Amino acid sequence: TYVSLADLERAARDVLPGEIFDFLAGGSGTEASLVANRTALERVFVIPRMLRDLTDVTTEIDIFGRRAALPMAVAPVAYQRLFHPEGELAVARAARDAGVPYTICTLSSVSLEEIAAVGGRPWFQLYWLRDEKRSLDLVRRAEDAGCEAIVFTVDVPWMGRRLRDMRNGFALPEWVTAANFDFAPATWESVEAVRAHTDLPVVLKGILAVEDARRAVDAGAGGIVVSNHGGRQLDGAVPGIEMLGEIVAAVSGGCEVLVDGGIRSGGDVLKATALGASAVLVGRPVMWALAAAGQDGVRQLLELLAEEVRDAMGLAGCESVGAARRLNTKLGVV
Amino acid sequence: TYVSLADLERAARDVLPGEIFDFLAGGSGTEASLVANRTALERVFVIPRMLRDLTDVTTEIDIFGRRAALPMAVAPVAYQRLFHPEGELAVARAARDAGVPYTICTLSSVSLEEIAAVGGRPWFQLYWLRDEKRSLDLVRRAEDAGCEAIVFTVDVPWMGRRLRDMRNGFALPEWVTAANFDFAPATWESVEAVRAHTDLPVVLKGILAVEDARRAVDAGAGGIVVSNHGGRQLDGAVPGIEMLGEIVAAVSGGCEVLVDGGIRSGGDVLKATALGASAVLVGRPVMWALAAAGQDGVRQLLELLAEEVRDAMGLAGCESVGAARRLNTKLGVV
Amino acid sequence: TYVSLADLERAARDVLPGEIFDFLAGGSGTEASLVANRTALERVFVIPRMLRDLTDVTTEIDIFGRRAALPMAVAPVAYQRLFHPEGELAVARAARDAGVPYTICTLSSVSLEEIAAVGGRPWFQLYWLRDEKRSLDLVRRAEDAGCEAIVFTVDVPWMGRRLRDMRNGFALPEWVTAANFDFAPATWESVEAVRAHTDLPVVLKGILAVEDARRAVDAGAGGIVVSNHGGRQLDGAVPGIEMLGEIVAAVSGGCEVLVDGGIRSGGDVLKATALGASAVLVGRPVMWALAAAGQDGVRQLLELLAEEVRDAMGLAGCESVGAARRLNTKLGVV
Amino acid sequence: TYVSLADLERAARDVLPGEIFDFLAGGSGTEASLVANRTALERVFVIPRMLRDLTDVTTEIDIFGRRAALPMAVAPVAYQRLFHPEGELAVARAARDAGVPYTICTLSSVSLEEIAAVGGRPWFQLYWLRDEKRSLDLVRRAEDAGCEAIVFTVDVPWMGRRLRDMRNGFALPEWVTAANFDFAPATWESVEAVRAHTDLPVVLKGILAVEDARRAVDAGAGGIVVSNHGGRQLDGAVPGIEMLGEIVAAVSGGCEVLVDGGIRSGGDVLKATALGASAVLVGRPVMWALAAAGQDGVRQLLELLAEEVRDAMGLAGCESVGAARRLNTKLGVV
Ligand SMILES: Cc1cc2nc3c(=O)[nH]c(=O)nc-3n(C[C@H](O)[C@H](O)[C@H](O)COP(=O)(O)O)c2cc1C
Ligand SMILES: Cc1cc2nc3c(=O)[nH]c(=O)nc-3n(C[C@H](O)[C@H](O)[C@H](O)COP(=O)(O)O)c2cc1C
Ligand SMILES: Cc1cc2nc3c(=O)[nH]c(=O)nc-3n(C[C@H](O)[C@H](O)[C@H](O)COP(=O)(O)O)c2cc1C
Ligand SMILES: Cc1cc2nc3c(=O)[nH]c(=O)nc-3n(C[C@H](O)[C@H](O)[C@H](O)COP(=O)(O)O)c2cc1C
Ligand SMILES: O=C(O)[C@@H](O)c1ccccc1
Ligand SMILES: O=C(O)[C@@H](O)c1ccccc1
Ligand SMILES: O=C(O)[C@@H](O)c1ccccc1
Ligand SMILES: O=C(O)[C@@H](O)c1ccccc1
Ligand SMILES: O=C(O)[C@@H](O)c1ccccc1
Ligand SMILES: O=C(O)[C@@H](O)c1ccccc1
Ligand SMILES: O=C(O)[C@@H](O)c1ccccc1
Ligand SMILES: O=C(O)[C@@H](O)c1ccccc1
């Protein structure tokens, strides 16, 4: 019995070792961006529509050539065995069963081929490596294994300053490894090398500047994720949700525009959609569910989110995600 | 001795069982909209006028063909026997004696005919039923019983997610029933079916989008209530008070424009009026009064509100509600 | 040793009976306007000027034909014997010695003639009485006694709802009386009756609407006080400080424009001046000083305020009050 | 092991006597400006750029004819022997070793010649003295000793009202003296006297009004520091960070534009740069480090700041400080 995503955070805090909970929860620096991701969503209010036909409400979208059950995917989160022994396999199985895309990480603690074998038409998140040819090898592995999109993370020339991790002296346990292995700053040249190497849609994750969104389209990206990396990279980076509307207007249908950071309910999904998002990513809550109850926990989380999305959409007069994108919003004060 | 509406909430909390107080107080989801209803009112400041003739201050209005003693009606609140054994009869009697319209609910715990027999020229709130012909039967019953307006609630295709009720496992006590009985999403077609079935003014309750207000006028509505259902429906819905001015301008006298959500004083009534409302509805405070002291409690609440409205109007230089509608406002910070 | 006005509030709270402290401190309703008076000042920041000649900084102004030592007068506060046995005489003596105008109240607890005999070129605050001819008698008494301005309070058609006083059951002690005696709502006609009866400047206290300020000038007022009566009248009335700039622009030198509400330091005086005020009134702090230490307390308060005003002006590059009125401001967040 | 500047404040509070910590931490009046310096920075969010070449990130700038390792100098802070026995020598040595300019104060507790002999191409802060000829003597001493800029503080016609110091009865210990000695308000004439006396760039510290910035350029200043003196002068003065963008636009490259007040991280440096600053000054944190651990403490602070600046710049896609100045920002809510 979980009735909100916050029930799951409480459950995860109970079971996880403190330093692992901190690795999960924390952000960089003073955690200004981490907090602002929540602030920004809480300031948005939706102007719902009434009296529309709701006889066949559907939360489905088409994205990167696949139907998804919700306008949502599981965000790339490294090292999922930190949270539960089944790690990425548990999460991927639940995502598959829920009809939600799952993003396999470069720093997965189970190999990408094993996770892809779970099924459910998975995405692959890329960190740019030592070498162009090595980078392109992970991309080719992902494609050969049936991944359907390459989510190239562009906001990590290096890892942010995670003061909780520094203070805890946090290190990976011996029993958690980067299973895809036996990194350098990405540039626009790296993006082109990836685009030239694969037929899969390339999705640039970590875009916040409007001109970078425009350039992403010009560069041949199939999508972007408007994101400050959950407040874990530049401390003081604007929340993605605050740039989303401007970015959606600037790209003017040229690529899919996803957003992440602080999505904690179906109502938040509705807000993101109303601001123009094609879909959202959800990170920490999926890990809370994994920590609390493994695969079944993630299943329950996704069922709860699905119900909340359906509920919010219908209450707002939206029989489809497209209708939700046409909702207006108004900023309030919290 | 109650000197503010907050005195009544304190009294009601003392006497009501926790789960019933929660059914009354709560909202949907995170209660963002519930809180925002209060935030929005607290941000509004009035610019009073001075030195005007106040030799005959009157708080009366004409609405739907009846004089009312205040620019206020009792909001539809389901299942009033939850709060006091006399339930709707106690509230309706006090409203009648105060010259305030009372809204009889589809989900009243005393039959609509019994409540109408109390007198006081009552309104009837409609939820759209299984069937057009059944829906229209409640409407015809209401009209035959002397109800003077049909308040069609348009923001409940289904009930919101009330997490307090879920956590409490709340259910109606055996001794409380829907006394009008021995529901489907409404659409604009439903509104037309109702309008075609009755000579009474049809008032659409739960409008927040400006274009829905315009469409309400085009559809032949006699009024609208600009409302987020007390924060009980879409969590994240904008407060009605924040949409009110824009809606008043858009309908440009084409129907009565009421507002509700968070009205807790005569000063709040003045604010609503200054933002352009024809009248307000008041929900929870009426139930606090009912719980605290039955009919006499509701009488005392309405007397207090009447005094506060008169006081606020005169201090603001308004001898009539029309003058109060011409007051200007200015947003502050709280 | 008082180094801020807040030192005096602490001292007054220690010595005064609770219900008298509440009569002094309180506002109407929820005290929204009382709090907002402070909020509004705290949001204002000054843009100081540097490198200007400060060899003869003067805080003096000319107002209503008299030099004053500061851009400040003691606000009308009824019944000063509530706070100290010497009441109005103690305050008036200290104001005289400091070169600050003192406003004698219609509801003074010492007769206006006695207070005027203290000297210091006093003002007289008028509440409109039962009768035009009686009202005009107080005005004539004030003028005969040497009062130099009539401060006609225009925001009290009746007293606001003071919930602290209601809850305390507050009443005047037997030993405090309205010493000018052995009231009706004012209108613009009342203002004209007063203007026709006296050669003294008539100052309308309690103006908040821009058009009322304009009408005050048209009506022959020599000044206005932009004021919400210290949050004691309409609860939800905008702070005077928020209307001041707009009012100053609208009257365009046609009368003196004073402001009051929440002035608690020389820096606040500077802010008021920079927003365009001719001068401020100070109410509660003067009573704190009276309660704490009688005449000497008020002297110390006025010395402290004088020092703070001089300090703030010079730090802001202003050798005169006129220069301070030409300072720019910028709203911040607190 | 310090991982943030806040670690150093905690360490300094532990070791310093309360009244000395208060002399350091405090501001004038109600400390409104002190707090606002932090508020203003916390409201700014950066819009980072992605995918840019970061193969040679450099935090260096050229200013007043010298390379500096960071866009930062140590602010003038009087009487550094209050914080550690080595006082200014410890701080100057660490600044030299870090490649950061150090501002020698008129009220240094070690003579300016001794501090200059440490090396590191130092600046000299001037307070205007009794006499033009005396003022010019300090300037000539500074120049003869190898100081490279004259930082003329223009916001201290006299010292602000420091209520912590008043309440503590704070006075310099016998063992701390103004070592440059065995003051009057500055004006634009004083600035010209200094400019005519030295070939060194004259930098006016404490400018907040846009027209004063313009006049500084017209007066021949080589730079300005946009500053409210750390909230220690006019209480209610706008934060420098809030005026910075407007000032940068108005001077349009005519002089260097520095800012100070509340810089507490490399991210704050990035924000200042993105708002257009040439460089920042840092005051209190340098003293925290000095108090906590002397020269080595200051070294550690500067190393930490250097790392944070590099980190923030790279995460924001900036290979140089010039690129950081071209970043856009967006205000949020905290
Ligand atoms: C513990 C953790 C690890 C993460 N690892 C990665 C990663 O390897 N690659 C990546 O692109 N993003 C990574 N992210 C960022 C997420 O993809 C996502 O941007 C962020 O979690 C969204 O915010 P939310 O957690 O508030 O939902 C990680 C986030 C967390 C919390
Ligand atoms: C316990 C409760 C039951 C309600 N039942 C109904 C209902 O049956 N029909 C309806 O249109 N609104 C219903 N409402 C909403 C109210 O009519 C009204 O919109 C809301 O109470 C106004 O906000 P307030 O309670 O802040 O005054 C209910 C509200 C509450 C608190
Ligand atoms: C205890 C008390 C009594 C007052 N009596 C009067 C009055 O008789 N006439 C009047 O015009 N204003 C009266 N005022 C209002 C003050 O003149 C003034 O508007 C208010 O005190 C200014 O705000 P401040 O107290 O924040 O300085 C009174 C205020 C207080 C606190
Ligand atoms: C204890 C202390 C002493 C100071 N002494 C001087 C001074 O002698 N001259 C001067 O121009 N500024 C002086 N300042 C102001 C600083 O140069 C600088 O403007 C301020 O410290 C910047 O804010 P920060 O402390 O928040 O970094 C002093 C500041 C402090 C805290
Ligand atoms: O945010 C995170 O922790 C991941 O994105 C991450 C980034 C770099 C190295 C390891 C893990
Ligand atoms: O300023 C705006 O309106 C947007 O940038 C915005 C701000 C906060 C939340 C969502 C969107
Ligand atoms: O808000 C409420 O509780 C009522 O509007 C309500 C709505 C639907 C079913 C029962 C009661
Ligand atoms: O933005 C506005 O001014 C209005 O939408 C509004 C906002 C808050 C309260 C009342 C009205
Ligand atoms: O604010 C106050 O208390 C006075 O203005 C006042 C007004 C009316 C009657 C008595 C006293
Ligand atoms: O909105 C504005 O700028 C003014 O009304 C104002 C608001 C708050 C304080 C002073 C002045
Ligand atoms: O802010 C401070 O304390 C210094 O700027 C200062 C100013 C004037 C005298 C002594 C010290
Ligand atoms: O109003 C603005 O945008 C600027 O004055 C400003 C305000 C707050 C922080 C930095 C900059």
Rounded-to-integer distance, Cα A97 and Cα B303, Å: 59
Residue at token pair 């609860």: C235
Query: How were these coordinates obtained?
Result: X-ray
| B262 marked as binding residue | yes
Rounded-to-integer distance, Cα D201 and Cα D216, Å: 12
Interface membership of C46 toward D (CB under 8 Å): yes
Least Cα distance to D94 among D119, D113, D130, D68 occurs for D119
Which residue out of A156, A177, A233 has the highest number of ligand 5 atoms within 8 Å of its CB and is therefore the one to mutate? A156
Least Cα distance to C36 among B310, D239, B331, D36 occurs for B331
Rounded-to-integer distance, Cα D58 and Cα D66, Å: 15
User: Both tokens of residue A252?
Assistant: 């003017």
User: Both tokens of residue C33?
Assistant: 């306007």
Interface membership of C186 toward B (CB under 8 Å): yes
Q: In sequence order, what DSSP letters do the residues of D104-161 get, joined into one string?
A: E-TT-SS-HHHHHHT-S--EEEE---SSHHHHHHHHHHHHHTT---EEEE-S-SS---
Rounded to whole angstroms, what are the CA distances from A268 to A9, A57, A63, A241?
17, 18, 20, 10
Least Cα distance to C121 among C101, C138, C141, C91 occurs for C101
Q: Are B160 and A315 in contact (CB under 8 A)?
A: yes
Element (H, E) at C22: helix C18-25
Per CB-CB distance under 8 Å, the chain D contacts of A207 are 50
| D131 marked as binding residue | no
Rounded-to-integer distance, Cα D191 and Cα D179, Å: 24
Helices (H), C219-265: 240-251
Among B84, B164, B229, B271, the one annotated catalytic: B229
Least Cα distance to A156 among A201, A195, A126 occurs for A126
Beta-carbon separation of D239 and C315 below 8 A: no
A99-158 residues touching D, CB cutoff 8 A: 154-155, 157-158
CA C140 remoteness from chain centre = 22
Interface membership of A265 toward B (CB under 8 Å): yes
Beta-carbon separation of A51 and B188 below 8 A: yes
Strands (E), chain C: 44-47, 61-63, 66-68, 72-74, 103-104, 123-126, 150-153, 202-207, 223-226, 256-259, 279-282, 328-331
Q: In sequence order, what DSSP letters do the residues of A259-275 get, joined into one string?
A: E-S---SHHHHHHHHHT
Residue at token pair 């206290």: C205
| D263 marked as binding residue | yes
Domain range list for chain D: 5-331
What is the Cα gyration radius of chain B?
Answer: 19
Amino acid, res. A139: V
Three-state DSSP at B70 gives: coil
> To what resolution in angstroms was this structure determined?
1.3
Beta-carbon separation of B51 and C243 below 8 A: no
Burial class, A31, CB count within 10 angstroms (exposed 0-12 / middle 13-18 / buried 19+): middle
Nearest CA in chain A to B33: A45
Strand B150-153 relative to strand B123-126, pairing: parallel
User: Phi-psi category of A90—alpha, beta or left, where left has phi over 0 and alpha has psi -120 to 50?
Assistant: alpha
User: Both tokens of residue A147?
Assistant: 């991944």
Least Cα distance to A179 among A106, A128, A283, A123 occurs for A106
Least Cα distance to A64 among A331, A196, A255 occurs for A255
Q: What secondary structure, in 3-state letters, does B244-260 show?
A: HHHHHHHHCCCCEEEEC
Rounded-to-integer distance, Cα B195 and Cα D157, Å: 76
Nearest CA to ligand 5 atom 8: A159
Rounded-to-integer distance, Cα D256 and Cα D135, Å: 24
Residues 6+ apart with CB under 8 A from B104: B76, B88, B92, B112, B115, B116, B122, B123, B124, B125, B142, B147
Mark whether B229 is an active-site residue. Answer: yes
Nearest CA in chain B to C164: B3
Rounded to whole angstroms, what are the CA distances from B117 to A118, B112, B113, B114, B298?
67, 9, 6, 5, 18
Strand partners, C256: C223
Rounded-to-integer distance, Cα A194 and Cα A188, Å: 10
User: Both tokens of residue B191?
Assistant: 């509104």
Rounded-to-integer distance, Cα D267 and Cα D46, Å: 9
Interface membership of D55 toward A (CB under 8 Å): yes
Amino acid, res. B200: L
DSSP type of residue C177: -
Q: Which of A4, A47, A312 sits opposite B163 (nearest CB)?
A: A4
Strand partners, C201: none
Helices (H), chain A: 5-15, 18-25, 32-43, 87-98, 112-117, 132-144, 163-168, 188-197, 210-218, 240-251, 266-274, 284-315, 321-325
Amino acid, res. C61: I
Q: In sequence order, what DSSP letters do the residues of A11-34 get, joined into one string?
A: HHHHHS-HHHHHHHH--STT-HHH
Q: What secondary structure, in 3-state letters, does C114-163 show?
A: HHHHCCCCCEEEECCCCCHHHHHHHHHHHHHCCCCCEEEECCCCCCCCCH
Rounded-to-integer distance, Cα D58 and Cα D80, Å: 31
Rounded to the nearest angstrom, the minimum Cα separation between D312 and chain C is 26
Strand B44-47 relative to strand B328-331, pairing: antiparallel
Rounded-to-integer distance, Cα B136 and Cα B198, Å: 9
Q: What are the backbone angles phi and psi of residue C190, rounded to the nearest 5°?
A: -60, -45
Strand D44-47 relative to strand C328-331, pairing: unpaired
Per CB-CB distance under 8 Å, the chain D contacts of A154 are 50-51
Strand A103-104 relative to strand B72-74, pairing: unpaired
In this complex, how many residue pairs, one in chain B and one in chain C, have their CB atoms less than 8 Å apart? 102
Beta-carbon separation of D42 and A32 below 8 A: yes
Rounded-to-integer distance, Cα D210 and Cα C52, Å: 15
Rounded-to-integer distance, Cα C13 and Cα C17, Å: 8
Q: What is the CATH number of domain C5-331?
A: 3.20.20.70
Rounded-to-integer distance, Cα A143 and Cα A149, Å: 8
Helices (H), chain B: 5-15, 18-25, 32-43, 87-98, 112-117, 132-144, 163-168, 188-197, 210-218, 240-251, 266-274, 284-315, 321-325
Cα dihedral value B123, B127, B131, B134, nearest 10: -30
> How many A from CA of C77 to the centre of ligand 3?
5
| D205 marked as binding residue | yes
Q: Are C74 and C101 in contact (CB under 8 A)?
A: yes
CA C5 remoteness from chain centre = 16
User: Both tokens of residue D114?
Assistant: 């001794």
Interface membership of D192 toward C (CB under 8 Å): no
Three-state DSSP at A249 gives: helix
Element (H, E) at C195: helix C188-197
Q: In sequence order, what DSSP letters do the residues of C283-300 get, joined into one string?
A: -HHHHHHHHHHHHHHHHH
Q: Are A315 and A115 in contact (CB under 8 A)?
A: no
Q: Which of B3, B267, B334 sits opposite C166 (nearest CB)?
A: B3
Nearest CA to ligand 10 atom 10: C242
Element (H, E) at D42: helix D32-43
Do chains A and D touch, with touching meaning 3 or more CB–CB pairs less than 8 Å apart? yes
Beta-carbon separation of D46 and A238 below 8 A: yes
- Positive or negative: CA dihedral B164, B165, B169, B173: positive
Element (H, E) at B45: strand B44-47
Rounded to the nearest 10 degrees, the angle between the axes of helix B284-315 and helix B5-15 is: 170
Q: Are B72 and B280 in contact (CB under 8 A)?
A: yes
Interface membership of D36 toward C (CB under 8 Å): yes
User: Phi-psi category of A64—alpha, beta or left, where left has phi over 0 and alpha has psi -120 to 50?
Assistant: left
DSSP type of residue A308: H
Q: Are D151 and D126 in contact (CB under 8 A)?
A: yes
User: Both tokens of residue C96?
Assistant: 């005289």
Chain A partners (3+ C-beta pairs within 8 A): B, D
Residues 6+ apart with CB under 8 A from A227: A155, A205, A206, A207, A208, A240, A259, A260, A261, A281
| B47 marked as binding residue | no
